């Protein structure tokens, strides 16, 4: 089935992405603490709810948080400054905190129930965020022998996420704080320059744009 494309709110980042983040894909944003990964997640959680002629997918959101970094007040701010009702935008975000990596994994199966529920309604789930994809795995699988074990478990988790993306036509968006293998569809390196400015580059994607997008963190989420 045809893929959909969720605008990020930045024309520059959208161009780098070929129009926006894709459904039937896992997009991983990675970078140092403070690089804006969670700001992009918040922004996407609002943008996906817009109609398609405004860069959204009329979609609902599911959000798995591992760092207590979801901020309903930030969603409210972004929504209001984009002409939307903040309470309605919040209503269409289903939120869960993952206690540990095994619970994080189970929450993917839990999520499929709501995905199925909403599928043939006018606001199907179109975005699934995992923020942070890796933090619990880092803390739990550590020391001699852990590289192989951690990579296996993370790959299984990502396979489960790919299945949801592909079976239900969902954009999966995941964050990673940074020679290991990765299995996301597309990896975007983010870094902070100065003030509210951020720079994005696609990694290991030689067939797509080789430049860099630049954007600012604003009351609308992100903008050129």
């Amino acid at each position: 089935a045809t893929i959909g494309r969720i605008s990020t709110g930045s024309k520059s980042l959208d161009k780098l992405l070929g129009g926006g983040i894709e459904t039937q894909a896992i997009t991983e944003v990675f970078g140092e603490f403070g690089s804006g990964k969670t700001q992009l997640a918040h922004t996407l959680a609002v943008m996906v709810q817009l109609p398609p002629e405004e860069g959204g997918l009329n979609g609902s959101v599911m959000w798995i948080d591992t760092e207590n970094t979801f901020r309903p007040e930030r969603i409210r701010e972004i929504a209001q400054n984009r002409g939307l009702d903040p309470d309605e935008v919040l209503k269409h975000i289903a939120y869960a905190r993952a206690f540990n990596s095994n619970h994080q994994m189970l929450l993917v199966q839990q999520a499929e129930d709501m995905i199925k529920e909403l599928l043939n309604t006018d606001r199907p789930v179109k975005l699934l965020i995992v923020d942070s994809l890796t933090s619990h795995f880092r803390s739990e699988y550590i020391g001699r022998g852990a590289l192989a074990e951690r990579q296996q478990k993370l790959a299984k988790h990502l396979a489960d996420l790919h299945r949801l993306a592909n079976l239900y036509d969902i954009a999966v968006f995941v964050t990673n704080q940074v020679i290991l293998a990765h299995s996301a569809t597309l990896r975007v390196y983010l870094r902070k320059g100065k003030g509210g400015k951020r720079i994005a580059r696609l990694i290991d994607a030689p067939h797509l744009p080789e430049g860099e997008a630049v954007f600012s963190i604003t009351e609308k989420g992100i903008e050129d």
Partner: peptide
């Protein structure tokens, strides 16, 4: 999951 719960609504936000």
């Amino acid at each position: 999951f719960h609504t936000a």
